[PDB]
Ligand binder design. Structure first.
Ligand SMILES: [Zn+2]
Lengths: 334, 74, 53
RNA sequence: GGAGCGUGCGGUUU
RNA sequence: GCGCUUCGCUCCCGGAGCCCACACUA
RNA sequence: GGGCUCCGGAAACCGCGGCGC
C-alpha cells in the first residue's frame, strides 16, 4: 500500500473540549468560500518552479505580474532545481515559517564516476535508510549530542549503468548534493547530482494542485481580462493549507477578536484540539470554520489541555486574521 | 587506539574507505596494524549505527591498503 | 534533461515509454519562463481555444 | 545612516 | 554576449495605530 | 507596564568585483 510516510503525515486525533460550541456563519470567511481578492490576500501558491532562475526571482516575477504588494517563499531551491515550491502571498507571507521544519521529498538523478554492479548498488543505497550522520565530530568542542539527520526512505526506481534514479524522503535541512556525493565516496567510484526535483514540501504535494508559472500568469489574465475566476481561483490555495501538517486548536467565536487584537489564548476559549501536543511547540489556532487565526507555542500538554479549565495555553505570536472579521466579545459583566 | 575496520576499497577521488562499528571524527590519526601512520580523516557519513570512515591519505602510495585492518590512533 | 513522467500515470523514469503504463513520457521539469513572457499572448489564444473561452 | 538567512566594494541623482 | 548579486522571513533599533481580552453560556 | 498589527531603516544610476549560462 505504502513505503512513503513522513512525520508531517501522521494523523493526529481530535479531542473535544466543549461538545456544544458552535460557529455563527455571519462572522469571518471560510477559506474556500471567500471573495477572490480576499482569497488572494490570504493565499499560497503551490508552484512548480522551473529550472534556471533563483527561487526568489520567480517570486519577484509573480509579485510583479499579479500586481501584489508583497510575496515570499519558504525553503529556497537552487536555480537548476525545479519542483514543488510554495509561494505565500500578501497577508499570508509569514506562514512560510511553518514549512521550514517540515519534511522534504525529492526525485534525483545520480551520475556515477565508474561502473558498479547493479545488484550491489541497491544494497549500499538501502543502508542509507534511517538515522544518518551529516557532519564529522571531535573538534575543540568536547560535545554532548551530535549531528544526526533522518532519512525516511530511499526508493530506487531505475538504474541504467552509470545513472541512478531514486526517490527519497528527508528531514528538514538535509543537504542533497551532499548526500549523493557521500554515497559516491562510499561506493568508491564517486558520484554527483545530474538532476533533482522536489516532489513534496510538508503539506505541499506534487498533485492536482501544483501549477506552473505559465498557467498561473495565464489564468490570471483570464480573470482580469475575460472575467473568469475559477481557473485563477483554483490556482491559489488558502493559507490554511500551509498548516495542514501542524497541531491545531479550535476556539469559540468569542475568543477570536481577543486573539486578533493580540491576546494570548486561555483554556476556556478552546473548543477542541489535537492529541499528543507537548510543551513549547508551534501550534495553529483555528476558528470552528477551520480558518487560521494565529500561530503560537503551546504552554500545556494537549493531553491535559482539556482537563484544566482556567489559565493560558498558547503564547500567541503571529496574527494573520484581520481584527475586522470578528466583533469584540469580551464586553463581559464581571 | 582501537581498531577501525577492514578497508573495503580505494575511492577514485582519493580516499581509503574503512567500514566501521563506531564513530571517529575529523583529523584523527589513522595507522596500520604495526603503528605505521596512514592518514587523517575528512568524513564520517551514513547510518549512525554502522558508519563509513573516509580517509584522505598522505603517503604517495594509496592502494596498498585494500583488505586491511587500519587501526585508529588516538 | 533526463528525468521523465507518465503524463497520464505520473510515475517517474529515464525511459521514453512507461514501464507498466500507457503513453510516452515527458520531461519532468516544467518549461522555462521569461518575465517578458513575449509570447504569452499567443499562448493564451491557444489556451482559450482548448478550454472554451 | 542597524545584524543575520546571503558577496560585496568605489563615485554620482533625497 | 545574455542573466543574476535577493522576493521575503527572523532579530535588533525607531515610529504610528489598535488593544489589555480566562472567552458573552442557549 | 504587557501584547498584537502596520509603516520605517532609502531609491535611480555609472565603475569594479562575485555568481551562472
Ligand atoms: Zn507508467
Amino acid at each position: 500500500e505504502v513505503r512513503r510516510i513522513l512525520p508531517a503525515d501522521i494523523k493526529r486525533e481530535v479531542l473535544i473540549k466543549d461538545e456544544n460550541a458552535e460557529t455563527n456563519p455571519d462572522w469571518g470567511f471560510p477559506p474556500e468560500k471567500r471573495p477572490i481578492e480576499m482569497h488572494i490576500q490570504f493565499g499560497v501558491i503551490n508552484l512548480d518552479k522551473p529550472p534556471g532562475p533563483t527561487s526568489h526571482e520567480v517570486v519577484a516575477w509573480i509579485k510583479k505580474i499579479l500586481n501584489l504588494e508583497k510575496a515570499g517563499h519558504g525553503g529556497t531551491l537552487a536555480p537548476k532545481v525545479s519542483g514543488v515550491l510554495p509561494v505565500a502571498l500578501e497577508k499570508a507571507t509569514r506562514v512560510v515559517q511553518a514549512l521550514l521544519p517540515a519534511g522534504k521529498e525529492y526525485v534525483a538523478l545520480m551520475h556515477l564516476h565508474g561502473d558498479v554492479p547493479e545488484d550491489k548498488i541497491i544494497q549500499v543505497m538501502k543502508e542509507f535508510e534511517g538515522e544518518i550522520i551529516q557532519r564529522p565530530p571531535l573538534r575543540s568542542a568536547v560535545k554532548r549530542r551530535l549531528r544526526t539527520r533522518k532519512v525516511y526512505y530511499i526508493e530506487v526506481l531505475e538504474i541504467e549503468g552509470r545513472d541512478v534514479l531514486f526517490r527519497v524522503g528527508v528531514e528538514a535541512g538535509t543537504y542533497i548534493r551532499s548526500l549523493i556525493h557521500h554515497i559516491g565516496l562510499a561506493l568508491g567510484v564517486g558520484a554527483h547530482m545530474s538532476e533533482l526535483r522536489r516532489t513534496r514540501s510538508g503539506p505541499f504535494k506534487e498533485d492536482e494542485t501544483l501549477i506552473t508559472l505559465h498557467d498561473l500568469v495565464d489564468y490570471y489574465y483570464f480573470w482580469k481580462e475575460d472575467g473568469i475566476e475559477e481557473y485563477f481561483r483554483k490556482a491559489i490555495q488558502p493559507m490554511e493549507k500551509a498548516v495542514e501538517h501542524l497541531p491545531k486548536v479550535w476556539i469559540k467565536d468569542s475568543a477570536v477578536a481577543a486573539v486578533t487584537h493580540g491576546a494570548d489564548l486561555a483554556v476556556p476559549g478552546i473548543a477542541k484540539l489535537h492529541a499528543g501536543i507537548k510543551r513549547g511547540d508551534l501550534v495553529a489556532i483555528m476558528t470552528l470554520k477551520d480558518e487560521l487565526v494565529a500561530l503560537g507555542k503551546a504552554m500545556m500538554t494537549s493531553q491535559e489541555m482539556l482537563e484544566k479549565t482556567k489559565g493560558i495555553a498558547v503564547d500567541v505570536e503571529k496574527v494573520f486574521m484581520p481584527r475586522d472579521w470578528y466583533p469584540k466579545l469580551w464586553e463581559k459583566r464581571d | 587506539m582501537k581498531r577501525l575496520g577492514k578497508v573495503l576499497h580505494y575511492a577514485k577521488q582519493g580516499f581509503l574507505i574503512v567500514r566501521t562499528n563506531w564513530v571517529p571524527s575529523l583529523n584523527d590519526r589513522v595507522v596500520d596494524k604495526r603503528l605505521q601512520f596512514v592518514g587523517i580523516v575528512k568524513d564520517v557519513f551514513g547510518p549512525v549505527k554502522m558508519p563509513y570512515v573516509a580517509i584522505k591519505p598522505k603517503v604517495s602510495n594509496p592502494e596498498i591498503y585494500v583488505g586491511e585492518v587500519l587501526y585508529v590512533d588516538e | 534533461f533526463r528525468i521523465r513522467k507518465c503524463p497520464k500515470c505520473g510515475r517517474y523514469t529515464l525511459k521514453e515509454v512507461c514501464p507498466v503504463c500507457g503513453e510516452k513520457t515527458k520531461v519532468a521539469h516544467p518549461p522555462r519562463f521569461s518575465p517578458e513572457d513575449p509570447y504569452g499572448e499567443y499562448r493564451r489564444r491557444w489556451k482559450r481555444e482548448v478550454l472554451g473561452i
